[PDB]
Amino acid sequence: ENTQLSEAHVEKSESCKTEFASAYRAHTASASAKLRVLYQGNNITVTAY
Amino acid sequence: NFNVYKATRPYLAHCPDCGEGHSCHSPVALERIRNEATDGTLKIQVSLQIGIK
Amino acid sequence: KVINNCKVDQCHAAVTNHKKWQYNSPLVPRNAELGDRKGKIHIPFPLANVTC
Amino acid sequence: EVQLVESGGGLVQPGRSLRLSCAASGFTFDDYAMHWVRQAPGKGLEWVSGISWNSGSIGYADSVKGRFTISRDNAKNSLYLQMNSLRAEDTALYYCAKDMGYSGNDDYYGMDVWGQGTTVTVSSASTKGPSVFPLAPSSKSTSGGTAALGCLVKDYFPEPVTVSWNSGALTSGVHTFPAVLQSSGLYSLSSVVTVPSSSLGTQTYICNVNHKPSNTKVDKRVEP
Ligand SMILES: *[C@@H]1O[C@H](CO[C@@H]2O[C@@H](C)[C@@H](O)[C@@H](O)[C@@H]2O)[C@@H](O[C@H]2O[C@H](CO)[C@@H](O)[C@H](O)[C@H]2NC(C)=O)[C@H](O)[C@H]1NC(C)=O
């Protein structure tokens, strides 16, 4: 009449705060660009969407 | 610090290989090996208590 | 304590009075459905972000 | 924050049923087995009944085995005890207590949390109010031994009778006794105060008897 009770469970590791992979859903994208223009012979930087 | 170990003790546990190719109860039995780090560093948990008299 | 009647090969004995607690390792039997004299030890050496 | 709150109780006649219950708070109800324990006046603790987690096992004391039923409502975090065919022998304080596990088959545990027990009295009697009588000092023979004067409160049914002197003004040298149940089913208690014998003819002493259940207050003057 000698019996043993065994149990186990799974939980997220503490390291999951640093080492993990993220699963994302992508939808649409917004383009933007950095343009150089030689305006009046000068080099000017234009940044815009 | 080590104040948390004031009420604790060392313990014996079973070891599958005590170095002779045979199993026995041993003061140096391992509990777990952790390798979460990617730089190759290992973190080993043992029954021994180090730094405490 | 001398029993005075039985043989040493007939009887069992163990130490029951302990003052210090130990990690509840999977290789050590539980003495109750839920362990008693519960305490906590923090684990040193946390994981961190570094450059190799 | 962990506590058990008793509810129910009061005066019931013999042969009638009474329902008791307890509310659990500060802990998870579904993680522990629950027990009922009762204590009669002048007696130690007596175990009455107990219920295991998920009602896996039910136990009763032999004296109530065919009369008491135990149940629990996990959704409401509450414990219930149904007492049928109550007898005079069942008069006691009834406490709820929480176990240290889900099973009662573990002998390594005791009862760690206890509530505030309620009073259950089983008797075929009405809430009769007290009669009050003075107990005059024997000043003729005790004058050199310091004077003792008192009062007697007799023939009342309800337990909680409060007696004080001089409307609480007299607290020193005051001795009161626990009430004793009489064969009539009624209780009686005495109260005495010790004073200088020379003050008997100068100071009036009043025995103030307060009986809440009957909304009755009696002020009795005690003299030589
Ligand atoms: C206005 O722009 C001329 C082009 O600019 C070069 O390329 C850009 C993308 C940026 O990297 C900038 O830093 C570079 O200088 C530039 O004249 C230069 O052009 C050549 C390359 O075509 C460059 O190697 C050289 O250093 C320059 N030559 C010149 C001075 O004629 C300069 O910034 C400027 N020129 C004018 C019109 O002022």
TrEMBL record, chain A:
Q: How does it assemble?
A: Homodimer. Homomultimer. Interacts with host karyopherin KPNA4; this interaction allows the nuclear import of the viral capsid protein. Interacts with spike glycoprotein E2. Interacts with host IRAK1; the interaction leads to inhibition of IRAK1-dependent signaling.
User: Which classification does the entry list for the species?
Assistant: Viruses, Riboviria, Orthornavirae, Kitrinoviricota, Alsuviricetes
User: From which residue to which, out of the full length, is covered?
Assistant: 908 to 956 of 1248
Q: Any idea what job this protein has?
A: Provides the signal sequence for the translocation of the precursor of protein E3/E2 to the host endoplasmic reticulum. Furin-cleaved E3 remains associated with spike glycoprotein E1 and mediates pH protection of the latter during the transport via the secretory pathway. After virion release from the host cell, the assembly protein E3 is gradually released in the extracellular space. Acts as a viroporin that participates in virus glycoprotein processing and transport to the plasma membrane, cell permeabilization and budding of viral particles. Disrupts the calcium homeostasis of the cell, probably at the endoplasmic reticulum level. This leads to cytoplasmic calcium elevation. Because of its lipophilic properties, the 6K protein is postulated to influence the selection of lipids that interact with the transmembrane domains of the glycoproteins, which, in turn, affects the deformability of the bilayer required for the extreme curvature that occurs as budding proceeds.
Tell me where in or outside the cell this protein is found: Host Golgi apparatus, Host trans-Golgi network; Host cell membrane; Host cytoplasm; Host endoplasmic reticulum
Q: What is this protein called?
A: Structural polyprotein
Q: Which organism is it from?
A: Chikungunya virus
From TrEMBL, chain C:
Q: Tell me the subunit arrangement.
A: Oligomer. Interacts with spike glycoprotein E1. Interacts with spike glycoprotein E2. The precursor of protein E3/E2 and E1 form a heterodimer shortly after synthesis.
Function field: Acts as a viroporin that participates in virus glycoprotein processing and transport to the plasma membrane, cell permeabilization and budding of viral particles. Disrupts the calcium homeostasis of the cell, probably at the endoplasmic reticulum level. This leads to cytoplasmic calcium elevation. Because of its lipophilic properties, the 6K protein is postulated to influence the selection of lipids that interact with the transmembrane domains of the glycoproteins, which, in turn, affects the deformability of the bilayer required for the extreme curvature that occurs as budding proceeds.
The listed locations are: Host Golgi apparatus, Host trans-Golgi network; Host cell membrane; Host cytoplasm; Host endoplasmic reticulum
Protein name listed in UniProt: Structural polyprotein
Q: Where is the secretion signal located?
A: none
Q: Which organism is it from?
A: Chikungunya virus (CHIKV)
